[PDB]
Design a protein around this ligand. Structure first.
Ligand code: ENL
Ligand code: MN
Ligand code: MN
Length: 315
């Protein structure tokens, strides 16, 4: 084995650079290194609140990315366009890092490594695909079994249970994978109090955070996905007012331009998997926020070449 090795058992920036090149070249991180990253990141994540609260000073910025779905070569493109993560270049990846795309192992271990390297500046929120029943079906479990073992997959599954469910910036912008709730009256403190270290239930706030979608008309509708709901602009307005928020940022739906701004400004979708499944032909985007101006700034990007492995090859 001549691949990347941790230094004194820890991630360093040189390790991360070596890992990204190793993965670009389609090689595998040694299982002992992968294991170390997973046990360390489980410990880091298990200390976090279900609601991560982040303050951006006036001169600070943060980048918000939506789903990435194992599109590792597109993830590298994000870092090339926008800079590597660092204490002065923070990131939030808003769930759905795995499944569908066939470089899910590379995406997730790269993201976990950066979480370890910059724990206060690199943030990962859970998506509906960071769950066992979805991974069983949509590629990630197959991919982990092919590259490592069933035991490694069980460890991933346990780490995913500790991913936080939402993040609030400056008490003003709330970020979650799916959306808002099937019932009125949910507060930020209710979100803080969710015991999240589990597979999601099929109803309730934890389910909604990972699964809901906005709809244009007022009200709520039964979701076409079979779980959670669609929520209208009235739902969003009431939630923002009770919680003294400005708007939400969510992901969870593919958008041809990489983003959408619904509910009159109040519900933003960002989606960071361009040409999803090598077929959708969509652009992707990421958002910049700044402590002096929390309004979203959108940066669009398009897909880059990857090795010839088909999406869902492991599903
Ligand atoms: O997040 C989702 O549920 C959607 C799909 C999925 O994750 O299964 C994929 C395409 C649009 C969104 O990302
Ligand atoms: Mn998705
Ligand atoms: Mn999703």
């Amino acid at each position: 084995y001549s691949g990347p090795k941790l230094e004194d058992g820890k991630v360093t920036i040189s390790f991360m650079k070596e890992l990204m090149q190793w993965y670009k070249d389609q090689k595998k991180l040694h299982r002992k290194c992968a294991y170390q990253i997973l046990v360390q990141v489980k410990e880091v994540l298990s200390k976090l609140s279900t609601l991560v609260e982040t303050t951006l000073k006036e001169t600070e910025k943060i980048t918000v990315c939506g789903d990435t779905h194992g599109q590792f070569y597109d993830l590298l493109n994000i870092f090339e366009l926008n800079g590597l993560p660092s204490e002065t270049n923070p990131y939030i990846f808003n769930g759905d890092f795995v499944d569908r795309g066939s470089f899910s192992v590379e995406v997730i271990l790269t993201l976990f490594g950066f979480k370890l390297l910059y724990p206060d500046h690199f943030h990962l929120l859970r998506g509906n695909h960071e769950t066992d029943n979805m991974n069983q079906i949509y590629g990630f479990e197959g991919e982990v079994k092919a590259k490592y073992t069933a035991q490694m997959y069980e460890l991933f599954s346990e780490v995913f249970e500790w991913l936080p469910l939402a993040q609030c910036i400056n008490g003003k912008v709330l970020i979650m994978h799916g959306g808002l709730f099937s019932e009125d009256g949910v507060t930020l403190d209710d979100i803080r109090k969710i015991e999240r270290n589990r597979q999601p239930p099929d109803s309730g706030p934890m389910c909604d955070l990972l699964w809901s979608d906005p709809q244009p008309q007022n009200g709520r509708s039964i979701s076409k996905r079979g779980v959670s709901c669609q929520f209208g602009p009235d739902v969003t307005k009431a939630f923002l007012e009770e919680n003294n928020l400005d708007y939400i940022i969510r992901s969870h739906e593919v958008k041809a331009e990489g983003y959408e701004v619904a509910h009159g400004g109040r519900c933003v979708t960002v989606f960071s998997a361009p040409n999803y499944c090598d077929q959708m032909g969509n652009k992707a985007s990421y958002i910049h926020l700044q402590g002096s101006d929390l309004r979203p700034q959108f940066h669009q990007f398009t897909a880059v070449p990857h090795p010839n492995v088909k999406p869902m090859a492991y599903a």
